[PDB]
C-alpha cells in the first residue's frame, strides 16, 4: 500500500511524453504498466498481487508475431496513459481503470492475420463472429483471463460498476477494428462542427473513447522517426506473411500485403497518413486540445516519408 513503483530518471520524465518508446527490455514492461496505472488511476485502483498476476497472464496470451505482440499492447496502453494524464478532469474513475486494461488487452491472442484473411481461410472465429472477428475474440480472451482464480482486478467494484467497466472495455476493444474508425471519425467531425458534441451524452463519450482507441492503436506513427521507421518493418512483415497465405489459397493479395511490391511502401505510407492517421489525430486534437503533440508528431513522420520518396533517404 506504501509500495510505489519508481522508474529510472530518464524513463520517469520521458514516460509522460506522447512519443515515449518503452524500450527493448521486455522485463521492464510490466513495471512500466503498473507505474502508469498507479499515476493515472491511483495505488488503490487494483490489488497489486491480482494486477501483477493479470498482467502476466495477458503477456502469456500474446503470441510471438512481428508486430501484434506484447510490446504493441504496452505501447498502446502508454499512449492511452499520456492522453488520460493530459486530460485529467475529463474522465470518470471507471474510465481511467477500464481504458488502460482495454489497451493492454486490445489484441490478446492475435495471430498476425486480418479479419479478411480469417474470412477467406474460413477460420472458425469467422463463423463465431461475422464482424470485427479478431476484436470480438480479443474481448472474449479478456473476460477469460479476468475469470481465472486470483485474476479479478475488478473484485472491489459493485455488480453494476463491474458491468459498466466491462462495457467500456468491450466498446474500447471493438473500436480498434479500423473498418469502424472511418464512420466513427465522420460522425465525431460532424458533431464537433455543428456544435452538437456533448460529453454528458454516453453515446458521444463512446464515440470519443472509440477515437482515443484508434489514436492509441496507430501511435507508432507518432514516435521519433527511427522508431516509426523500424516499427513499419514489423508491420509489413506481418502483412507480407498474410499475402503469402492469400497466394496459398489462390488469391492475389492487395499490394499492401504483396512483398513483390515492397518498392511502393513509401507511397503506401503517404496514403495511410493522409487517409487514416492525420484525420484521426486532427479530429482527436479538435475534441481534446492537449493531444496536439500526437498530430504534430504524425505530421513530422508524414514529412519524413515524403523525404523517402524524393530519394533524400
Ligand atoms: C504504419 C502503420 C500503422 C500504425 F499506425 F499502426 F503504425 N498501421 C498501419 C496499417 C497499414 C499500413 C500500410 C499502409 C499501406 N501500405 C500500402 C502499400 C505498401 C507497399 C506496396 C503497395 C501498397 C498501402 N497502404 C494503405 N501502415 N500502418
Ligand atoms: Mg487489433
Ligand atoms: Zn492493436
Question: What's the arrangement of secondary structure elements?
Answer:
Layout: H1 9-14, H2 29-40, H3 48-60, H4 70-85, H5 93-105, H6 115-121, H7 124-128, H8 133-146, H9 159-174, H10 178-193, H11 202-217, H12 225-248, H13 265-287, H14 292-309
Helix pairs in contact: 2-4, 4-5, 4-11, 5-9, 8-9, 9-11, 10-11, 10-13, 11-13, 13-14
Bound molecules: ligand IG6, magnesium ion and zinc ion (ZN).
PDB class: hydrolase/hydrolase inhibitor
Keywords: phosphodiesterase, PDE10, schizophrenia, HYDROLASE-HYDROLASE inhibitor complex
Assembly: monomeric
Question: In short, what is this structure?
Answer:
The active site is at residue 68. Helices cover 64% and strands 0% of the residues.
Number of domains: 1
**Rg, alpha carbons:** 19 Å
CATH structural fold name: Catalytic domain of cyclic nucleotide phosphodiesterase 4b2b
Shape: globular
The tally of beta strands, per DSSP, is 0
Instruction: Tell me the structural class.
Output: mainly alpha
Bound molecules: the ligand Cc1c(C(F)(F)F)nc2ccc(CCc3nc(-c4ccccc4)cn3C)nn12, magnesium ion, zinc ion
Order of helices and strands, N to C? HHHHHHHHHHHHHH
Question: Helical element count?
Answer: 14
Beta-strand content bin: under 5%
PDB class: hydrolase/hydrolase inhibitor
Keywords: phosphodiesterase, hydrolase, schizophrenia
Assembly: monomeric
Entry title: CRYSTAL STRUCTURE OF HUMAN PHOSPHODIESTERASE 10 IN COMPLEX WITH c1cc(nn2c1nc(c2C)C(F)(F)F)CCc3nc(cn3C)c4ccccc4, micromolar IC50=0.0038755
